[PDB]
Amino acid sequence: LKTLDNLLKTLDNNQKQALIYFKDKLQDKKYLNDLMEQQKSFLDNLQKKKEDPDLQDRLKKTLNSEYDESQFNKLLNELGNAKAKQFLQQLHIMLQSIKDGTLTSFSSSNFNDLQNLEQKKERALQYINGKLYVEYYFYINGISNADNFFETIMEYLKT
Amino acid sequence: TGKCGPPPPIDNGDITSFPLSVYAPASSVEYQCQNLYQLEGNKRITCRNGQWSEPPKCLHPCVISREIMENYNIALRWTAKQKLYSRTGESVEFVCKRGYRLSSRSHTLRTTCWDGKLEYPTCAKR
């Protein structure tokens, strides 16, 4: 518990609220469909390209989608204080940019089928939430390590 | 006399008014483009002593190719769709597919559409 408290002592209110937000999405089963689609799409690519039979055979099995506080704390410990704070801070910026309507991505062709900002905010939020969930459970399942979780989720959180 | 004839035609565009055969000096016409085409240049043209000012252009939208995306190991960010119409001047956002990292220059994941032409980023096996 000492290392977890050593991280929480370094976090501001914005980072602490991003932590509550991320943990909350990991406990939401409505994102299970996103993980199954990601699982199928990733297995199909490996099968098509005849790559990594060991990983394909692990991907034919059911992924664990159960939340566990100790596994959550282990991810933050494996990232180290620095990466964990950079991740929570960037999660704050992404969420604030959606809330404010200032996210640059909103002007992209990727949202131009939507009539108003509220619809745009909903697409952005539902996509970020799905990515936080998918990336965490790919880690929990051993398909990716803590460093891979970090670099992959930071790509999606870029503003 | 400083009178003009009919204003010039522009590909995938048209004038906002009904076409007259003769136009008075300093008279003006405005152009509009087809649904997904983007106007580039001035919207209005004026008849200046028997000659019209330079008409604008209506530039083509970019059609996001599912096959190019598959070959470059990329996908559209924010959506599950592999089909997208991008207008000239708009940015398109991509992500690497899972298991791939960016192999093209940084900032290539966000790129501008211009008259049907788009530069796609490339991702390579991690």
Bridge-partner residues for B95, per DSSP? Answer: B75
Number of CB pairs, chain A paired with chain B, less than 8 A apart: 52
Q: Collect all residues of chain B within an 8 Å Cβ-Cβ radius of residue A112.
A: 85-87, 90
Q: Collect all residues of chain B within an 8 Å Cβ-Cβ radius of residue A37.
A: 80
Beta strands in chain A (DSSP E): none
Of the candidates A37, A109, A152, the beta carbon closest to that of B86 is on: A109
Experimental structure resolution, Å: 2.2
Of the candidates B78, B97, B98, the beta carbon closest to that of A110 is on: B78
Q: What is the largest CA-CA distance in chain B?
A: 71
Q: Collect all residues of chain A within an 8 Å Cβ-Cβ radius of residue B62.
A: 109
Q: Which two tokens stand for residue A107?
A: 């002007």
Bridge-partner residues for B74, per DSSP? Answer: B96
Q: Collect all residues of chain B within an 8 Å Cβ-Cβ radius of residue A123.
A: 78-79
Please give the radius of gyration of chain B, using alpha carbons only, rounded to the nearest integer: 21
With an 8 Å Cβ cutoff, are B87 and A42 in contact? no
> Does any CB of chain B come closer than 8 Å to the CB of residue A156?
yes
Name the region of A132 (left: φ>0; alpha: ψ -120 to 50; beta: rest). alpha
User: What string of DSSP letters covers chain B?
Assistant: ---B-SPPP-TTEEESSPPPS-B-TT-EEEEEE-TT-EEES-SEEEEETTEEPPP-EEEPPEE--HHHHHHTTEEETT-S-S--EE-TT-EEEEEEPTTEEE-SPTTTTEEE-BTTB-----EEE-
Q: Specify burial of residue A69 (Cβ count, 10 A radius: 0-12, 13-18, 19+).
A: exposed
What letter does residue A14 receive in the DSSP assignment? Answer: H
Rounded to the nearest angstrom, the minimum Cα separation between B93 and chain A is: 7
Do A95 and A22 contact (CB within 8 A), yes or no? no
Rounded to the nearest angstrom, the minimum Cα separation between B103 and chain A is: 14
With an 8 Å Cβ cutoff, are B85 and A109 in contact? yes
What is the identity of the amino acid at A133? Answer: Y
Q: Collect all residues of chain A within an 8 Å Cβ-Cβ radius of residue B86.
A: 109, 112
